[PDB]
């Protein structure tokens, strides 16, 4: 049960695009954009896999996706 945080995306980024961007890596039980965004994964391996595959994705307009786990 590890959270993944998204940051610096495009303006058309909705709650669905956030789910479509991150669901091919693990089972999502909770997620939200909130103006920054986060995704809650069940397994912690699904979180580490999504960070390595989406940090610096290039969403366009010079926007690089910042994806990272939190401090501990």
């Amino acid at each position: 049960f590890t959270n993944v945080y998204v940051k610096n995306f495009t303006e058309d980024f909705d709650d669905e695009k956030l789910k479509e961007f991150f669901e091919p890596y693990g089972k999502i039980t909770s997620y939200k954009v909130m103006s920054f965004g986060f995704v809650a994964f069940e397994t912690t391996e699904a979180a580490e896999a999504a960070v390595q595959a989406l940090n610096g994705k290039d969403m366009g307009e010079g926007k690089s996706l910042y994806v990272a786990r939190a401090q501990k």
């Binding site: 909770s30 986060f38 990272a68 786990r69 501990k72």
Partner: protein
């Protein structure tokens, strides 16, 4: 004239009301409160007329609409404490920040007030690691401090507060108040073992929080 807010500070003959926007505090005297002051909770929803407040009226629960709290639990560090424990600062609300693993990049900030804390009497300074949930406004909710639990034995008791066999400042015994004991137990004796957390004021000395008696 007529506002609405929440009780944030309760002292001897006076108190403070956190505004509806959680961004200011309003002083009020107990003489201007309509009801019993001892029966007043922290975070209690009130309606007050401004003079400095006057004619403070207690409200039923959920009378003040608030944003829905999301389920996911997050971890963060405190940046600014509340002005209630730190009257030195300018900003009223506290600040909680989710940081990266390197603890150098700010992921997001979330403000918190008196209604955001699980323990309204808890002392949250800068640098404390917290576990919290986010409401629909982005503010912090269900704020609880992550502290390593300690356990020692009760050494003495003096009225409504005693001391544990835990050494802190210059080899002193850890203070604790009976307002932090769990259960419905009235029996606490020297020699009993309690599991507790250690809180410390960054302007003075130390204390202990949430101590439950471990005797099986």
């Amino acid at each position: 004239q007529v506002y609405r807010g929440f009780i944030a500070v309760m002292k001897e003959n006076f108190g403070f009301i956190e505004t509806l926007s959680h961004d200011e505090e309003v002083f009020f005297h107990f003489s201007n409160y309509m009801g019993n002051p001892n029966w007043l909770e922290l975070g209690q929803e009130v309606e007050y007329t401004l003079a400095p407040a006057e004619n403070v009226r207690m409200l039923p629960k959920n009378s003040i609409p608030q944003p829905a709290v999301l389920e996911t639990t997050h971890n963060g560090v405190v940046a600014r404490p509340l002005r209630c424990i730190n009257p030195d600062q300018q900003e009223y609300a506290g600040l909680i920040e989710i940081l990266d693993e390197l603890r150098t990049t700010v992921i997001s900030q979330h403000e918190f007030g008196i209604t955001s804390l699980v323990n309204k009497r808890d002392l949250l300074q800068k640098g404390d690691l917290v576990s919290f949930r986010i409401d629909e406004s982005g503010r912090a909710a269900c704020v609880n401090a992550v502290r390593q639990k300690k356990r020692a034995t009760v050494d003495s008791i003096k009225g409504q507060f005693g001391f544990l066999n835990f050494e802190v400042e210059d080899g002193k015994k850890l203070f604790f108040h009976m307002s932090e004991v769990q259960g419905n137990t009235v029996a606490l004796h020297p020699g009993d073992t309690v599991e507790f957390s250690v809180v410390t004021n960054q302007r003075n000395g130390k204390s202990s929080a949430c101590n439950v008696l471990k005797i099986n």
